[PDB]
Design a protein around this motif. Sequence first.
Motif, mmCIF file in Angstrom:
data_model
loop_
_atom_site.group_PDB
_atom_site.id
_atom_site.type_symbol
_atom_site.label_atom_id
_atom_site.label_comp_id
_atom_site.label_asym_id
_atom_site.label_seq_id
_atom_site.Cartn_x
_atom_site.Cartn_y
_atom_site.Cartn_z
ATOM 1 N N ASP A 20 -9.316 5.915 -2.553
ATOM 2 C CA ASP A 20 -9.092 5.765 -0.780
ATOM 3 C C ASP A 20 -9.829 4.598 -0.172
ATOM 4 O OD1 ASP A 20 -7.560 6.163 1.452
ATOM 5 O OD2 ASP A 20 -7.129 7.729 0.857
ATOM 6 N N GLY A 46 1.754 0.142 3.642
ATOM 7 C CA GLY A 46 0.812 -0.288 2.736
ATOM 8 C C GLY A 46 -0.665 -0.033 3.312
ATOM 9 N N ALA A 50 -2.680 2.324 6.506
ATOM 10 C CA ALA A 50 -3.368 3.618 6.519
ATOM 11 C C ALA A 50 -4.906 2.116 7.120
ATOM 12 C CB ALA A 50 -3.711 3.652 5.281
ATOM 13 N N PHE A 154 -5.973 2.712 -5.311
ATOM 14 C CA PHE A 154 -5.171 4.043 -4.653
ATOM 15 C C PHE A 154 -4.253 4.606 -5.628
ATOM 16 C CE2 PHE A 154 -4.006 7.000 -1.374
ATOM 17 C CZ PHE A 154 -2.535 6.972 -1.160
#
Length: 167
Positions: A20, A46, A50, A154
Amino acid sequence: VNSFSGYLKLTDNVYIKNADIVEEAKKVKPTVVVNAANVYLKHGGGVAGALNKATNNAMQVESDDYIATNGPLKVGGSCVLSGHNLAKHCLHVVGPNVNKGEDIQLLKSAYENFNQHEVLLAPLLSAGIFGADPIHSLRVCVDTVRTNVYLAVFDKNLYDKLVSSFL
Ligand SMILES: O=c1[nH]ccc2ccccc12
């Protein structure tokens, strides 16, 4: 030696991990995190959405002032802004968005921005909601970036496919 941990080495200078990017930036506090930006620096979804959420919208506030002064970026271009709580700096890079009909040849130009920075934490440009083939994005990255790049992917499924298919 640097702080990046758990990466698979693809080449002399390119490393990859299933991670992440918001969580990786928070842990490492790299000198440079790359954002998957658009020309308006509108960080709605996206990587951009984030990252911006993780800054409590401070990235968007700073970006709005940048655009009000300078106007939009170019597709294939970049700007350096604050990394806020995630990094020293954020390199906002605009890869072509296939879902808007932009020239995929601009992906190489986008990755050339990375060469102005000795070390970066980055996503695959033009992947995800930008609509390009991530396998292609990784090939352009390896063939364009000469500085040390730590790629965060991701999707575990996609990560495993990128590694298994890497030439
Ligand atoms: O929504 C997201 N949170 C953290 C990382 C990320 C990376 C790509 C797309 C979306 C996200």
